[PDB]
């Protein structure tokens, strides 16, 4: 007991020393000279109408044309961006749903929410509909985020200090993850489908391997609940949204927070962060009703998509970078370029 | 300047929108209520009788209206991350017991119940949403005050030691903490174990908030 406590204290001191050893110069002391994106006079091209309630999540498909978005009304829509056509409408089992997923091979989707369960639907059926193929249970607190690893593996996280990797084929948790202290709200899957980083409401982020189950890193630096997390498309960094009116960009190797986005006249929450395809725009939503676009390398200014009249909740980009879609509490979704 | 396939795609999209809007329009004629209270509050009796893990979605149909009573008591998380999802509910139903008027759980029950009622009242999402209150366990209270001096929990009252006097203090002290009588109002009521008033009071509060809604929809 005492020896274990001493070893833990020594390891914590080593971790603190490692964190301190890598805080000499940062992005704004290196990349602040990069050429500004200027004013993104970025205008609506289509208004996807149809939502009868708030929007909580959208996800872009792999063909850059087929889109998925879902509401706290109980609908999950597969929709066409080029011609503003709706391809599929999927009803859900419980409306308190706070995340969605879209399979990379193009055949499946997934959803999850407070009811603690993660559900998987199959698209390319020969009989002419979209049906549910799996229901995954075994978490105890609310389910907040889910990603697809392949056609047969799915990663979920919940409000329990628990994460899990799930074999879709059998329904059995291959390996589960424990070690937070507060509720876990999100995760963002690596481009290589081998890792995931999760944010939890203790100003905490944790990095995990899917095969084993062990955690390898924990980052701190915030002051309230961390609501939304995403991932840099090359697998070296990620960005989280905090409810103390700041956005952050951590690295999955630097073992600390890299940058913070904040301003004096901003005191509202961050409900989502996502990147564009090239990575030179960080699009972040707030409660001040604006879906601001940041120069993600300078944290300097904010091009503004002042189109909405309620809280922002989600936003994403396509795989070829053609369009961006923002979804906010006003029951509308906007396609922009 | 379209082929046949594009025209078929347009037809499919429009059909989807029609059915979607119909379903969404029918899904706005429901009544949504969230249940709250303290631990070991006796709220089980109210939940069973009143009728008006994850979430216990208790559904009821009463007076042609669909009451979704969300019991969220199975959750062990801060309410600050998952309560705002109900910001469209008409009502919060609150349950607290009279019996523990001087029973120290550590201090006593009534102080923390009042903390909960105050916390629900001034919660910024619930600015325009009404709070319906049940005080319960009144027969055991009328029996039990026969020995207690009543002044243990409230060492500033010196009223008559009968049932109605102490009950009037309990009800007024619960109704006291409203800071915003301009927009919302708190309704007080005590649990009628041999009556169905526990249903009618809640129904009337819901109806009144609905009329307020349809009236301030005209700009008044």
């Amino acid at each position: 007991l005492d020896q274990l406590r001493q070893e833990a204290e020594q390891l914590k001191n080593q971790i603190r020393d490692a964190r301190k050893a890598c805080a000499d110069a940062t992005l704004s002391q290196i990349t602040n000279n990069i050429d500004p994106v200027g004013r993104i006079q970025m205008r609506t091209r289509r208004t996807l109408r149809g939502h009868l309630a708030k929007i909580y999540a959208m996800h872009w498909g792999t063909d850059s044309r087929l889109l998925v978005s879902a509401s706290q009304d109980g609908k999950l829509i597969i929709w066409d961006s080029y011609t503003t056509n709706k391809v599929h409408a999927i009803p859900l089992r419980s409306s308190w749903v706070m995340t969605c997923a879209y399979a990379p091979s193009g055949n499946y989707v997934a959803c999850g929410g407070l009811d603690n369960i993660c559900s998987i639907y199959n698209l390319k059926t020969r009989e002419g509909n979209v049906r549910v193929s799996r229901e995954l249970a075994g978490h105890t607190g609310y389910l907040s985020c889910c990603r697809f690893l392949d056609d047969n593996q799915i990663v979920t996280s919940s409000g329990d200090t628990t994460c899990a990797l799930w074999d879709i084929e059998t329904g059995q948790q291959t390996t589960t993850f424990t070690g937070h202290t507060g509720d876990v709200m999100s995760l963002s899957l690596a481009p290589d489908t081998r890792l995931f980083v999760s944010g939890a409401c203790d100003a905490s982020a944790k990095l995990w391997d899917v095969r084993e189950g062990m955690c390898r890193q924990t980052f701190t630096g915030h002051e309230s609940d961390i609501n939304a997390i995403c991932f840099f498309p090359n697998g070296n960094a990620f960005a989280t949204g905090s409810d103390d009116a700041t956005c952050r960009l951590f690295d999955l190797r630097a073992d600390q927070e890299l940058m913070t986005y904040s301003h004096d006249n901003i005191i509202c929450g961050i409900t989502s962060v996502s990147f564009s395809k090239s990575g030179r725009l960080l699009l972040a939503g707030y409660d001040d009703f604006n879906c601001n676009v940041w120069d993600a390398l300078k944290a300097d200014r904010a091009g503004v998509l002042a189109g909405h009249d309620n809280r922002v909740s989600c936003l994403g980009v396509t795989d070829d970078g053609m369009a961006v879609a923002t979804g906010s509490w006003d029951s509308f979704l906007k396609i922009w370029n | 300047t379209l082929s046949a396939e594009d025209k078929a795609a347009v037809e499919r999209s429009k059909m989807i929108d029609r059915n979607l809007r119909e379903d969404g329009e029918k899904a706005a004629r429901e009544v949504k209520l969230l249940l709250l209270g303290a631990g070991e509050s006796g709220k089980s009796t109210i939940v069973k009788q009143m009728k008006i893990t994850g979430i216990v979605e208790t559904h009821f149909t009463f007076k042609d209206l669909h009451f979704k009573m969300f019991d969220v008591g199975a959750q062990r998380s801060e309410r600050k991350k998952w309560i705002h999802c109900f910001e469209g509910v008409t009502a919060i139903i609150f349950c607290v017991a009279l019996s523990d008027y001087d029973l120290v759980l550590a201090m006593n029950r009534m102080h923390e119940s009042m903390k909960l009622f105050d916390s629900i009242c001034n919660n910024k999402w619930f600015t325009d949403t009404s709070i319906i209150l049940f005080l319960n366990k009144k027969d055991l209270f009328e029996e039990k005050i026969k020995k207690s001096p009543l002044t243990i929990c409230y060492p500033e009252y010196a009223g008559s030691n009968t049932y109605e006097e102490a009950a009037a203090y309990i009800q007024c002290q619960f109704e006291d903490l409203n800071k915003r009588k301009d927009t919302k109002e708190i309704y007080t009521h005590f649990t009628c174990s041999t009556d169905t008033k526990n249903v009618q009071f809640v129904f009337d509060a819901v109806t009144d908030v609905i009329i307020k809604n349809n009236l301030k929809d005209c700009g008044l």
């Epitope: 063909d63 066409d80 | 082929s3």
Partner: single-chain antibody, 230 residues
Framework: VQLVESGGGLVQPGGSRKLSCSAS????????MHWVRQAPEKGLEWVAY????????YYADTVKGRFTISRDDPKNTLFLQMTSLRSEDTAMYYC??????????????WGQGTTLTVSDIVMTQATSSVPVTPGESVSISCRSS???????????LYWFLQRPGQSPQLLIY???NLASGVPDRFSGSGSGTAFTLTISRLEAEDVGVYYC?????????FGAGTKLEL
Amino acid sequence: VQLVESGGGLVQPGGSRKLSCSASGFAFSSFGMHWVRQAPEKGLEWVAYISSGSGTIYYADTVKGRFTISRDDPKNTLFLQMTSLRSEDTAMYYCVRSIYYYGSSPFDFWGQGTTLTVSDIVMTQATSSVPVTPGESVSISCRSSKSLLHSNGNTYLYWFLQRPGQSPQLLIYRMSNLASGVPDRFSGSGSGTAFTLTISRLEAEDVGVYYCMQHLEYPLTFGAGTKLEL
């Protein structure tokens, strides 16, 4: 997935006929339907198209006014009713399923075909017969009288295979893409009104008649046919 024709037989000129289609094993009320016919010894001929929502109907130039197409969703059935029968209508019929949304495969499954015995872009084939022996590769063509490449990036050529006693099988939908249930040794493609099909490493059951089709503007017209011979 199962589609079945019904209602054929022998009819004199005049009177009326009604061919029905019973479908089972799939979501009937979300697809669009066609009727396609074939001559007693020759190529195919389109007849009619009906779509989801019962709002769009198209007919053939040779029949219009004599024909009427309809669908019934709750019972999962399809109907085509014809009047004033003539000798040019002696044929064999088929229902065909096809659903339209981004990325679907039209003409995916064919029915069996009923038989009816009765007492304007132009597309033809290039050859008539090529003797074929197993172990060798084969290729077949067609030509059309007008472009099939629409504005929005498509090319509406459809390639089909028929074996003796069998129904057609969707070798190729939209002239470049392969259907489900068919071996990967098949392939098909096209050009500026010149079209082609290929079968590598010829096997048995790969000997039959091969058919081309267009879908750019109603009505739809076929060729006459190309056959390989063992």
